[PDB]
């Protein structure tokens, strides 16, 4: 009786709006350009599945089309916010050791989880044996870097798909985005770009959690009276 | 639980089908969100293939009309002893200042190339710019 | 009247610089390891230069230096590889300190 009204006013309501959390106000094509998000690797490193997202090559240096980055980033931030709103477990992953400390702090600050260390075989596909039969796996995995330190795809991309966990991922011009659910073409090397990503996801997640509390609190006050 | 055949369809299609077949008792927490705001591309595994024969990548080189003026400026006057400041988003080098003057004079009717390049150098020297020919 | 990405790219200092070889740029030291200076100069990758022998103590975090660029990204394809090997750092020569 009361459960259907709960799920209808709290869980189904936000899914009826194109931008319920107003994540489009967090960035612009200019702010992405100032953070050097458009700078890609040299043409000799290009991955074939990244050609659709490449604006061109400026003196053998691939340029990422920020017009597509903005549309992909909008979808990725929107999905992340809805998952945080629904109280999902969000796990950030990245083997780039220059940003390990930054990413672990960002995860602790937004109330989520980080795994920037060596990824042991079976953390996801054998979790019930490694953690316990009642362990809950992440509802969303966000790759700030999709490659491991030998320039191969992070093993967790394949294993997240095996466990049917949606993935958000920053994909540089040398990355493979085929199995990434919500890919975002962009620079994953420059500190300005990585810092921007961390601010956007952290802000999107923090807003969505505050929105969930505002809606719940309002739903309870109106319930009594 | 869900099928682990990550190369057969996508997590959405595999989940949707097993929910239909009654195999999955409940839909995962993300399913309703994906359905309302799907990605631009369905994440399906694909095998990367090397190109053979006459197949080429469709990426084009990024050129601008002013690149011809820059190539000539660097060949005549070399890189300006002034250092680039790539942190300033509005930085203007001696070459860019040369390109702008060159463009203004071209809009005034002048069409010759060799003549339009010598007049630009004089204009900058009158403004106090240092232009040391490399040779 | 929203500026497009094509307009930003055309008028960016990195685009207006043209080829990077033998170009003088201004860098900033953001990380130091013993005598290895990690310098950001506005590109995708940083460069690593060794502390000069003269006035070595003047090179600290935040110090702005002058560089002569050689390549924005060191890459190369070697025998049998399907893609290029990249060391994820630029190549530049540390000339000295920038002062006003």
């Amino acid at each position: 009786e009361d459960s259907t009204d709960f799920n209808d006013k709290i869980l189904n309501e936000p899914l009826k709006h194109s931008d319920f959390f107003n994540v489009k106000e967090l960035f612009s094509v200019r702010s992405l350009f100032d953070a050097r998000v458009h700078l890609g690797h040299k043409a000799g490193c290009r991955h074939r599945f990244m050609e659709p997202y490449i604006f061109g090559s400026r003196l053998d240096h691939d340029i990422i089309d920020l017009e597509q980055t903005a549309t992909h980033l909008q979808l990725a931030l929107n999905f992340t916010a809805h998952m945080a709103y629904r109280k999902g477990i969000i796990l950030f992953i990245s083997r780039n050791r220059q940003f390990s400390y930054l990413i672990e702090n960002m995860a602790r600050d937004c109330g989520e989880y980080a795994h920037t260390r060596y990824f042991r075989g079976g953390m996801l596909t054998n979790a019930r044996l490694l953690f316990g039969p009642t362990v809950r796996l992440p509802d969303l995995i966000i790759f700030l870097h999709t490659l491991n330190n030998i320039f191969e795809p992070h093993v967790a991309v394949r294993d997240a798909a095996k466990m049917n966990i949606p993935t958000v991922g920053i994909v540089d011009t040398n990355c493979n985005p085929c199995l990434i659910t919500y890919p975002v073409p962009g620079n994953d090397d420059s500190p300005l770009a990585v810092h921007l990503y961390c601010r956007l996801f952290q802000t999107a997640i923090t807003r969505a959690k505050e929105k969930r509390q505002q809606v719940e609190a309002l739903y309870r006050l109106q319930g009594q009276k | 639980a869900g099928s682990r055949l990550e190369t057969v369809g996508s997590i959405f299609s595999r989940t949707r089908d097993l929910v239909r077949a009654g195999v999955l008792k409940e839909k995962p927490l993300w399913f309703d969100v994906y359905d309302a705001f799907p990605p631009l591309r369905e994440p399906v595994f694909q095998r990367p293939r090397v190109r053979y024969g006459k197949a080429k990548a469709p990426i084009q080189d990024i050129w601008y009309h002013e690149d011809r003026i820059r190539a000539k400026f660097y060949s005549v006057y070399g890189s300006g002893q002034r250092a680039f400041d790539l942190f300033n988003p509005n930085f203007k080098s001696t070459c860019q200042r040369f390109v702008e003057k060159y463009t203004e004079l071209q809009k005034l009717g002048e069409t010759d190339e060799e003549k339009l390049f010598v007049e630009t150098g004089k204009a900058l020297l009158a403004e106090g710019v240092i232009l040391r020919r490399v040779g | 009247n929203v500026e497009s990405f094509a307009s930003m790219l055309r008028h960016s200092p990195l685009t207006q610089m043209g080829p990077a070889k033998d170009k003088l740029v201004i860098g900033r030291i953001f990380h130091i390891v013993e005598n290895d200076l990690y310098i950001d100069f506005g590109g995708k990758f940083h460069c690593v230069c060794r502390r000069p022998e003269v006035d070595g103590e003047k090179y600290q975090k935040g110090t702005r230096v002058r560089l002569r660029l050689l390549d924005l990204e060191l890459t190369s394809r070697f025998l049998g590889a399907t893609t290029d090997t990249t060391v994820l750092e630029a190549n530049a020569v540390l000339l000295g300190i920038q002062e006003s």
Binding site: - | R70, Y74 | S4, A6, P19
Partner: peptide
């Protein structure tokens, strides 16, 4: 359409091909 789009042309910064010390000599 748009004036700021790239244009198709040959590399203007392309360096001339190197020549051996005997290029053009009998």
């Amino acid at each position: 359409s748009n004036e700021d789009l790239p244009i198709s042309m040959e590399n203007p910064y392309k360096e001339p091909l190197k020549k051996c010390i005997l290029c053009g000599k009998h």
